[PDB]
Design a protein around this ligand. Sequence first.
Ligand SMILES: C[C@@H](NC(=O)CCCP(=O)(O)Oc1ccc([N+](=O)[O-])cc1)C(=O)O
Ligand SMILES: [Zn+2]
Ligand SMILES: [Zn+2]
Ligand SMILES: [Zn+2]
Ligand SMILES: [Zn+2]
Ligand SMILES: [Zn+2]
Ligand SMILES: [Zn+2]
Ligand SMILES: [Zn+2]
Lengths: 222, 219
Amino acid sequence: EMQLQQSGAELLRPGTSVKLSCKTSGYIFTSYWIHWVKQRSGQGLEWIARIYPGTGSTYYNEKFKGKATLTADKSSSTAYMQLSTLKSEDSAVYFCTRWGFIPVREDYVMDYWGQGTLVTVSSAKTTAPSVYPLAPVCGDTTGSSVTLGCLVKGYFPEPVTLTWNSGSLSSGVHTFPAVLQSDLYTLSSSVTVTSSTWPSQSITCNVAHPASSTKVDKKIEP
Amino acid sequence: DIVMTQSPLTLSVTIGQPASISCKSSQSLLYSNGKTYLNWLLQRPGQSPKRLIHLVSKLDSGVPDRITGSGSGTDFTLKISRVEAADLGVYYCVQGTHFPYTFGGGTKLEILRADAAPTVSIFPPSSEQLTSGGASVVCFLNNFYPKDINVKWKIDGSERQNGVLNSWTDQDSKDSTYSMSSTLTLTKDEYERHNSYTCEATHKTSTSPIVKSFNRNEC
Ligand SMILES: C[C@@H](NC(=O)CCCP(=O)(O)Oc1ccc([N+](=O)[O-])cc1)C(=O)O
Ligand SMILES: [Zn+2]
Ligand SMILES: [Zn+2]
Ligand SMILES: [Zn+2]
Ligand SMILES: [Zn+2]
Ligand SMILES: [Zn+2]
Ligand SMILES: [Zn+2]
Ligand SMILES: [Zn+2]
């Protein structure tokens, strides 16, 4: 089972630099080219560079010479991409991929991709979120089924992890994308259950914000 | 650099119907060895991109043959013979014939399903929040279709445009509907000075606005 694991989200100050990692397993690391791709604001892909770990040979897209530096550690099967002097345009999600094109066969083998690493370039301060339970009053939807909610607001930077009842409750859950306003993000999630389940059995909202080491559980009480 | 143009930007297709996406290049993609390095990738919501086709028409392993690709020179086409729910996502054509490799802008494929009316739930501020001096009124508009919807907040009869924060989910791969959250934030002081809080929506499924509100008082 071929896998590529990338490092977690990064908050970087303008003008500094970061080294992203792409740890692979399940295949002979030295025999395949590893490519790095950039994704800005949803749909908008750009090819950065490629490296053949076996020899250290790299090819760069002109736009990225000086911006990106690719390296590979054969002993740990890890590919690295260092981004230098970060600015506005560098905020994006970066993917590494064992693309699969075999130059000598002029054909391809399956492409495997990492999960992506989000890089946020900002000088705004890290702020822990405030988690608020949303119990119905009019958002009861009458009888039959009732929907509860969880409001996570005033945090920086992304991401935040929100689960219901530690992951047990996954059906009928809607988690909305965070929206930035005044240097802070707001996020919300709704859960619809039947009138019989709640209030009878408890529903709890679990929130985690790694950047600030905040972990909070809020029970939805009537 | 080679400019790759994709059309349409978005396509709405019902399950079981065919779909085709176009990709045009500013240079011929015929490489000097006689091969044409044109690939098609699919990026599903919340997933990394995945290659569906290579060399214009060759399918990658594990890709359903309902997907086919064709074209040559500067014009290429990806066709899906019969659309399934799993086809939801953004399709991209990417060329590797000229350096540097360049991508098309993407085509979003969305599942056209029957009209669905939003289920609306409104929530007053929690005690927790009021204690801190803030007050957010939340309105969830769940499982509707089409995505086109307009929400307005009205406090005691007049529209409130400031302090509103909206967010939409992408299309759900289980029922093909969309969901939206709307949060109105005020100070605790101003919240306790008003009475009626109304979340009002406009949607194709109704000739009159879809309403959800509450009156704050005491007891
Ligand atoms: C002249 C030249 N081109 C080639 O050798 C052919 C490469 C074709 P490939 O599909 O691998 O290009 C891609 C397309 C896309 C991506 N990608 O999206 O990661 C990677 C590679 C060269 O590189 O010297
Ligand atoms: Zn092939
Ligand atoms: Zn060329
Ligand atoms: Zn040439
Ligand atoms: Zn008034
Ligand atoms: Zn008045
Ligand atoms: Zn008023
Ligand atoms: Zn009044």
